[PDB]
Design a protein around this ligand. Structure first.
Ligand SMILES: [Zn+2]
Ligand SMILES: [Zn+2]
Ligand SMILES: [Zn+2]
Ligand SMILES: [Zn+2]
Lengths: 91, 7, 82, 571, 97, 572, 7
């Protein structure tokens, strides 16, 4: 029901499974021998992975919403590092 | 010039 | 069995591109002078490029240029409404 | 005399020649140097080196702080938009994205961004990028409506007076009323806490919003309310704006005595503070030429529009909406002035240039195309009549048939069916159908044109009387309804005499119609009389157009502020 | 709706609750994952204790500050909240180097 | 209904908005993220920031390696060349400098620089900057020339076949002839040391060189050699290119039963592999619409040029050679299709557009203006005779006279004096003078075109007969030289039925003239015979009309390559 | 319409 997400800094980021299935790579983490499930994100630091998890609650809540969806804020100092994590996670 | 200018 | 059926022209563009009114409304020619004595025969015409316009609008367009307004192809009617 | 270059200018050229290596260090220069390095890149034609830095909000915010050299920034920016880089769209989007990132931040930064957004959004509004200045101001307005501090409502209206200006020029009138209603929300709440904010610029925008929709009775209501709030301590830009819009609303109310003292003061007031080569001064001239064209002072009206265009052709580069509005206004005046001559080559060139700019920068379904297409179509239908080729005559009329009905739909969709602009497009279709040998359709357009012009405007008006003469000319010259043209010719002349006297230039087309009226039915005694009246009009017409150009009519220091307003208010 | 996160040392639970939802069932949500007694657990927003009786919206966790993209954080104590990391500070560029 | 934005696309917008502080750390991003950032610079309108980031080969090479999104790269690249940023010229110069430095360096490093050059030179050849891809390919030729062993001989011939392509399309035929001889040396050199390569790519590439120089007899000879070398291991792009040029040369040899077999498979093979929105598949359609234009199937040829243009109008932007050659082909076909109807408005628009593109991207003395300015002149000389205005009658004929003289000068400079293409423009001059009423030179130009075309093409061809009908109409309608005009009419009428059939569209313009020659002398008995078959010609037109789009004529999997490559050769 | 199409 929940997915235990750890970062490169060892931070714990347990999030609901339906939120973490938005990204394709985490779906591969939960599939196979990986199946709270421990997942390793040794290359993704915690300051950029926190924004990834904030997107999951932002993505799932705002699916097929009738109202104007606010843009996800991604700060300039994190945007480049978050972009690499967005590609790797297929988020 | 059989008419006036355009409004 | 009483039934209700909305009829409409099966174009998906649903806007004339000459008069720029709705494809189901009257053309700008028939919506300016007489909208009751001329509205009955203000039909729409398609083309080989499958871009339907108001027949009044497309004829008024062909009186100057011989191409479809949207894509510059040779204009030839394929069907009308009547 | 071979004066050596300054070491400053010589060092500009040395740094620009080594721009690529030192492009990072130029961004840390003082603003006066930094603008001059960037202006030299434009002068050298290196728009890609220059445009790759103007796309950054921080760099452009630094070159916006050089207030004296804004006449060069408005000319580099326009050259950048023509060059193919969307710096206005990027800077509006780069600001809005950055503005939304400090919503949860402190109010110290949140007030610096509004300062940046007013010099940026006010620049884009000045440059003519209303669709992009609106995106900046909507972000500035969003900053004012998060923390409910005393100063914030003072700035939320200051956004909503500029957010309303960028929607009047963009023809978002249906959002314009929503903005003014939103403006009073913070205006009333500010007035509750012992602070009556000056409602002078805000009320002046409705003098242009409601005039644009031709709510002349409603526009004049807010024309008075705007000038009651003019104070000598106000900025000249705010004061000049109200006087222009008040003049525009006064002329369309068929009152000219109060209108001349406002705009002529405004032309001088803009020429004093700003200068003779300022965008704001050219804005007055177009509104000043609006007076001269309407009051039949047509000979000097072309020069005022040409003077306005020459200012905008220098400050605002090649393809700008401010150059285009000057073109479509000068083309109409050149159409009116050269209507008697019949030669339309300068007028058609300006009318074609105006549509060539508007179609390039604005969408093809935009309201400013209604005025530009109308002006060219009036010129097109009059070129074909004056030429002798039948094939050209049958083509230019149909070419002008496309424009009027395309223009009519733009007015009908936005302004609605019952409005002056929609009726004014019917009158042009009345001229159009008469010249296309479709005589029966020309009558039903004129009747529809009058019945709308007569209704909202009133019985006696400039607009309704000008179209009666066309209907009178239709009943007279070609469809042989001589019994109906007699009362219409007199009705047009009676209104023309009331507001213009014997100096009205359209009486020639009315007196000549009256001569043709009786030569086919009888009563030849009035033919000699009306020919004498036409003769009396002829030499009286050659008495007033020889007055000097209207540019020096305002002279220097004719009157003073806080006195022209009072003179207007009492009368 | 209210979206928020809870942190004790390095944990972060991205759970949600209604604007009228109370701390009582929110604390029981923590027991679903942390499998620890709820009475021992105490929560800490901006160095302030929260009673279980009052709702989440009564303590200041309104929807305006609990957006899914920028959730409001609240500490957890059985405070040793570990910061995530320092992002690489970009040069000011406009500042002279 | 308002789906949320992807985190990737949201981070792309945030990185692009943060360009100034991160314009150099983007170059350290992965391969697939660099393109998406640089695409967002195009989408946002930041062409000035993107132009400075595609003029550098160090970062543009990583962009080129994104093969999935190459259709977006062609439209960004064309956006900058339209923008004013000479990206192709700088990348040619940025690679010309690079090759010289690596030339002294290790040969293994030279292998990497050659592979980059094929990707960059191949792109600039695909994008249509042939003059700027020749410089890249010449630089790649220098690296392979320096070393002489088995490893670099495969690349040296690969440079030469690619260098031949960027010169055939650039109308540098005087250099394309010698570069095959240079390529001929490396084929023999590779064959000497016990190694055999594929000659299909090279033999079939010069088939366009000979076709463009109107050496149709020699072009067909090399097509047979090209078809011999087709094997199963060749890439589809190579097989499509050799099937395209084989079809083009089979048409001008007046055997259309075999050109259709080669171009229908080429259309299917290009569509099956490259898809329906690929610039290579668009290249096939222009050669497929070249076949249908020359077999009197004009009604099915406009729909193919319009389909080939729409691919090149979307894959490539405006002001490009590939969207210009698609206009000038469609402007000619719409001129031919609307020749009887007289609706020369779409055809003139597609002719003026191709004029405004070539004069912007090519020099005034380029040979591709010969075909572009000709097609505009043919449309102009028919608009004026269609309208009923006097002042425009002299202006349009005079303006069309300038283009044909200009088209003749460029053709004569490159093809010499006795050439089919130069003689083709002579026939256009003859029709020009007939409308402009300078009959003294009209007979000279028409008989000069006939003399050269019959001398080289032959006495039995489609091209030679069309010029005869132009001269035959000159004698009949105005010159009144009926004693030899009737011989000319029967010559063109008989050959038209032999080549195409009784339903050939050009027979109507010959029937009307030949009847008018008979009514002018009073012979009314033979007139009734033609009016008995002129109605039959109209009757035959009703059955042969049958407008079905030729895009689905090729269907799905008619044959395979092995059957098509042998059916052209077994029948040969 | 007198002659044929251009080559
Ligand atoms: Zn319509
Ligand atoms: Zn209609
Ligand atoms: Zn169409
Ligand atoms: Zn640029």
């Amino acid at each position: 029901m929940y997915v235990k997400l750890i970062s490169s800094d060892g931070h714990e980021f347990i999030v609901k499974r339906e939120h973490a299935l938005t990204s394709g790579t985490i779906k591969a983490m939960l599939s196979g021998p990986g199946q709270t499930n421990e997942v390793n994100f040794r290359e993704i630091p915690s300051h950029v992975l926190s924004k990834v998890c904030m997107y999951f609650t932002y993505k799932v809540r705002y699916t097929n919403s009738s109202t104007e969806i606010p843009e996800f804020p991604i700060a300039p100092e994190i945007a480049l590092e978050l972009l690499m994590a967005a590609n790797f996670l297929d988020c | 010039l059989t008419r006036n200018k355009g409004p | 069995w009483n039934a209700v059926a909305l009829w409409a022209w099966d174009i998906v563009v649903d806007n004339c591109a000459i008069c720029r009114n709705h494809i189901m409304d009257l053309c700008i020619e028939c919506q300016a002078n007489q909208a009751s004595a001329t509205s009955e025969e203000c039909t729409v015409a398609w083309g080989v490029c499958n871009h339907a316009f108001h027949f009044h609008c497309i004829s008024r367009w062909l009186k100057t240029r011989q191409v479809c307004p949207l894509d510059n192809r040779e204009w030839e009617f394929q069907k009308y409404g009547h | 005399e071979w004066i050596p270059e300054t070491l400053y200018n010589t060092a500009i050229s040395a740094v620009v020649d080594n721009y690529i290596r030192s492009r990072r260090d130029i961004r840390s220069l003082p603003e006066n140097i930094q603008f001059d390095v960037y202006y030299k890149l434009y002068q050298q034609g290196r728009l890609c080196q220059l445009g790759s830095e103007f796309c950054e909000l921080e760099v452009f915010a630094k070159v916006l702080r050089a207030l004296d050299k804004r006449h060069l920034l408005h000319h580099c920016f326009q050259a950048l938009m023509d060059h193919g880089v969307k710096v206005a769209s990027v800077l509006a989007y780069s600001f809005s994205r950055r503005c939304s990132y400090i919503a949860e931040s402190d109010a110290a930064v949140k007030e610096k961004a509004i300062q940046v957004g007013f010099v940026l959004g006010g620049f884009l509004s000045d440059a003519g990028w209303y669709s992009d200045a609106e995106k900046v101001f909507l972000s500035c307005l969003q900053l004012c409506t998060l923390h409910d501090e005393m100063l914030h409502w003072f700035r939320a209206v200051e956004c909503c007076v500029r957010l309303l200006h960028v929607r009047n020029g963009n023809c978002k009138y249906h959002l314009g009323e929503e903005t003014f209603k939103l403006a009073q929300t913070y205006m009333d709440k500010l007035s509750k806490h012992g602070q009556q904010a000056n409602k002078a610029a805000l009320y002046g925008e409705l003098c242009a919003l409601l005039f644009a929709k031709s709510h002349y009775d409603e526009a004049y209501k807010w024309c008075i309310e705007a000038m009651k709030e003019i104070t000598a301590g106000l900025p000249v830009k705010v004061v000049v704006d109200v006087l222009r819009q008040a003049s525009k609303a006064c002329v369309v109310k068929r009152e000219f005595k109060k209108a001349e003292q406002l705009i002529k003061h405004a032309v001088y007031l803009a020429r004093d503070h700003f200068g003779s080569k300022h965008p704001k001064y050219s804005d007055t001239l177009l509104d000043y030429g609006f007076y001269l064209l309407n009051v039949d002072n047509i000979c000097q009206s072309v020069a005022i529009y040409q003077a306005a265009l020459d200012i905008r052709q220098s400050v605002f580069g090649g393809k700008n909406i401010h150059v285009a509005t000057a073109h479509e206004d000068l083309a109409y005046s050149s159409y009116v002035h050269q209507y008697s001559s019949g030669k339309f080559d300068n007028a058609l060139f300006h009318a074609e240039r105006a549509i060539g700019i508007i179609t390039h920068i604005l969408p093809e379904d935009h309201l400013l195309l209604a005025s530009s297409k109308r002006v060219k179509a009036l010129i097109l239908e009059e070129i074909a009549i004056d030429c002798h080729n039948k094939e050209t005559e049958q083509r230019l009329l149909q070419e002008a048939h496309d424009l009027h009905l395309s223009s009519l739909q733009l007015a009908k969709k936005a302004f609605g069916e019952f409005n002056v602009q929609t009726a004014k497009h019917y009158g042009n279709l009345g001229r159009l159908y008469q010249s296309m040998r479709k005589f029966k359709e020309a009558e039903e357009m004129h009747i529809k044109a009058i019945q709308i012009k007569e209704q909202l405007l009133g019985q006696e008006d400039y607009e309704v009387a000008l179209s009666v003469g066309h209907l009178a000319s239709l009943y007279n010259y070609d469809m042989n309804q001589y019994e109906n043209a007699e009362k219409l010719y007199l009705r047009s002349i009676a209104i023309g005499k009331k507001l213009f006297g014997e100096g009205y230039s359209g009486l020639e087309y009315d007196y000549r119609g009256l001569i043709k009226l009786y030569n086919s039915i009888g009563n030849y005694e009035k033919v000699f009389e009306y020919h004498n009246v036409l003769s009396n009009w002829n030499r009286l017409r050659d008495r007033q157009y020889s007055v000097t150009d209207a540019l020096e009519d305002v002279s220097t220091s004719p009157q003073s502020t806080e006195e022209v307003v009072q003179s207007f208010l009492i009368s | 709706d209210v979206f928020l996160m809870i942190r004790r040392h390095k944990t972060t639970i991205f759970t949600d609750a209604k604007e009228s939802s109370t701390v009582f069932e929110l604390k029981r949500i923590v027991e679903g994952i942390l499998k620890r007694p709820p009475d021992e657990q105490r929560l800490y927003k901006d160095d302030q204790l929260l009673d279980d009786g009052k709702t989440l919206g009564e303590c200041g966790f309104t929807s305006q500050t609990a957006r899914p993209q920028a959730p409001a954080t609240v500490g957890l104590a059985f405070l040793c909240i570990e910061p995530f990391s320092s992002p690489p500070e970009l040069p000011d560029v406009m500042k002279p180097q």
